[PDB]
């Protein structure tokens, strides 16, 4: 009979067409079945990089470090390389622009003891925060696979994580990335550059009228020129599978 | 001193271009200033029609008539003219497709006494539910102006309505209409055909990185042929005012 995870290597053509390598993992929530081009890489655990802004936001909100999605975290005045970071932000825009320094401040206020307790409660990856409390998701010990991202995201979708329903609703609002009359995408990008292998991530889900498709993808990212392929390759897979037009 | 409300008749060109008549009202939240092509019509009261699905959703959620945005409202098996109504719905899809029969059932469960009490607590329009308990927003005594729609929507945006924060967050989720890297629109269409003057509505807001623009428009709508002009004319005004690209 059928397997929980089916391997579809035809999606490799989307990576090869773009001279790239990686994995797309999909989970059909109604069917309770998943699909991927590479079962091994789907289960390979990597640094989460800015995809960690999902659990970091949940923890900050539940502890009151972030009061709500409108609270302003003023720019500290240091001019950084990414121009969108050199301004005031709230939770919505800090997630949209992947504003690392805002989330580093959240992490310092959370502190290592509460951060570790929460990640254990979340069953998140290898639950390892070794390194600096304000950078472990970039260059410390935490590792999470694409299938583990999906497991975590499904809990968040269903408000089943061990934080309040309010915290989960606010983070799902902040994850809003695209919406039209055909679908809604709630998702978070990531770009791991500090420790090899350099990779890009996109994790989240596609809401349809009558089903939800969870997704997690990562791909080799030797330079920043390929960052747009995170969404583009995912959408090519979604289009091939008739999930989006 | 500066003016809270300013009339801009140049927006009438967007109505004339489409052989139409109506009013667009905008509110710049940061500046606390409003703008409209027709101050008189902006303040005249009309049937809300399906824009009433906003308060109706809030009341149904707060009373527990609707448990959450996933609860299924099974199709009653009666084939109606609008094809998307002839299927099961949840709160998200019932809003999206403006599924009147689902909301008529909500209104019957809410009942006259609680519906009236809630509309008074919301300061919603003339607060008058005279007429049939399950159609008064289509052919009863309730009336609301475009400026009153904005005032109600601003309360919803700020979680200031008397119902729970949870109920307000769920309805704002269900109002999601469009989202991209430039803006998020949360809104509700309406179409009042049962009592003259027949009009179309679009009410909601545009979320930017650092501001929110509330909007409420109504326009003469003698047939369904022009329904798309509700969004099209609003977007022409938003583009003219540099709110969206
Ligand atoms: Cl949302």
Residue numbers in the entry:
A (entry chain B), B (entry chain A): 21 to 265
Authors' text:
The OXA-48 carbapenemase is widely disseminated in Enterobacterales, necessitating new treatments for producer strains. OXA-48 is a class D SBL that uses a nucleophilic serine (Ser70) to hydrolyse β-lactams, with a proximal post-translationally carbamylated lysine (Lys73) proposed to act as the general base for both the acylation and deacylation steps of the reaction. Diazabicyclooctane (DBO) inhibitors, including avibactam and nacubactam, act on a wide range of enzymes to overcome β-lactamase-mediated resistance. Here we describe investigations on how avibactam and nacubactam inhibit OXA-48 and two variants, OXA-163 and OXA-405, with deletions in the β5–β6 loop neighbouring the active site that modify activity towards different β-lactam classes.
We determined high-resolution crystal structures of uncomplexed, avibactam- and nacubactam-bound OXA-48, OXA-163 and OXA-405 to investigate how differences in the β5–β6 loop composition relate to DBO potency. In contrast, such differences are less prominent when the avibactam-bound structure is compared with that of uncomplexed OXA-48, although the Arg214 RMSF increases slightly in the former. In contrast, in the avibactam-bound or uncomplexed structures the t-rotamer is preferred. Val120, the other residue contributing to the OXA-48 deacylating water channel, consistently adopts the t-rotamer, as observed in the crystal structures, in all simulations of the uncomplexed and DBO-bound enzyme. Arg214 is considered to contribute to the carbapenemase activity of OXA-48, possibly through its stabilisation of the Ω-loop, modifications to the active site electric field and/or hydration.
